[PDB]
Amino acid sequence: AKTLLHQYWDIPEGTECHRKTYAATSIGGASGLVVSAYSVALKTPTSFLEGVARTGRYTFTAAAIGAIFGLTSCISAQVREKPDDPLNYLIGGCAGGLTLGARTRSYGIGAAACAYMGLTAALVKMGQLEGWKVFAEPKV
Amino acid sequence: PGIVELPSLEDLKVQEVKVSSSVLKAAAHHYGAQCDKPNKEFMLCRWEEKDPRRCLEEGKLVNQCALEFFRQIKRHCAEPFTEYWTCIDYSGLQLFRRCRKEQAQFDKCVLDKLGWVRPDLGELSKVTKVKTDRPLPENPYHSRARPEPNPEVEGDLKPARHGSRLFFWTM
């Protein structure tokens, strides 16, 4: 939601670390709860303990993606000392994609997720950095 | 916001007409006959300016007119006006058709010693003029002025500048 993505982008980036990883776990847990809610509403896994298993699995994988994304963002920002270039979030998205492939236990899915999550994380970084009004002016 | 102003009880005490609803309903038409010439100043005040705490002086005047009317009906004819309202009292909802004998008695009484012709049906109607003393008000809704008119686009119109001015399709 808006309040916790504002919690994520409130931190100077920069380093005010593990606040970043806590907010990224919050993002991943919320997204996994969304996906688990739809996937238990449209599948009905028969039975309820397996539904708890599927929800815990999806939320744990999405929270792990968020946590490792935030950790390697923090580490790349501390090492390179450059809060400007999106290559740190490129490394971040690739680390998140490789841990996604580690959880789903398929290496090609992990490589493709590395590539696309790195590109999208760099695009979100550049959208926040340069300033790209997504969805709306809504004026002319 | 701006707090309200209310008159205190140094002014809001007229001796009330402390008769009940039965006799006050029974004595209606003659109350409209002799009195209720100066009540329309009060009612015009109330309908022009929608503000009580303004027309209370004329409320005092109509209250003393009603009290003087009932004092006059107590002094003159008669005593069986008491009989008339205690005859219209116990008849449930007050029909004017049950106790009509004593209405004729009361009308003969009031024509003998006071006059006071009964108003015809439906002569307590027929929208009425009255002269006043206070002026007619502007902006009785205590609101601000009107913000802006809209600049009206008028005049004739020319053919358009180079047609569409889209990507192409010039004229």
Partner: protein, 99 residues
């Protein structure tokens, strides 16, 4: 589209159910009549955005006539302060039926 055969034929089929301050069957008012009359006469020939930025005061006045939010807030605070001081033990109050 918002077609206006409604206005072209000259038939008042939908302009009487619509708003307050119209002609009621017996000529009677509403509860918040003059508030809407002033608000509509504020925002009549105005393009619905500077009507927001200019006719806002009378609109909030009409809303607080309609729901009576802040007046019930004030009454609620009066009763709660009444409760806390009568629990404290000051002036078992004779404002009702007396002074």
């Amino acid at each position: 589209p918002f077609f206006d055969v409604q206005k072209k034929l000259g038939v008042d089929l939908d302009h009487w159910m619509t708003i307050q301050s119209a002609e009621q069957p017996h000529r009677i008012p509403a509860r918040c009549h003059a508030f809407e009359k002033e608000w509509i006469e504020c925002a009549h020939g105005i393009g619905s955005i500077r009507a927001e930025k200019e006719c806002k005061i009378e609109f909030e006045d009409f809303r607080e006539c309609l729901l009576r939010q802040k007046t019930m807030k004030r009454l609620n605070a009066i009763k709660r302060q009444r409760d806390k001081l009568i629990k404290e033990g000051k002036y078992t109050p004779p404002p009702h039926h007396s002074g």
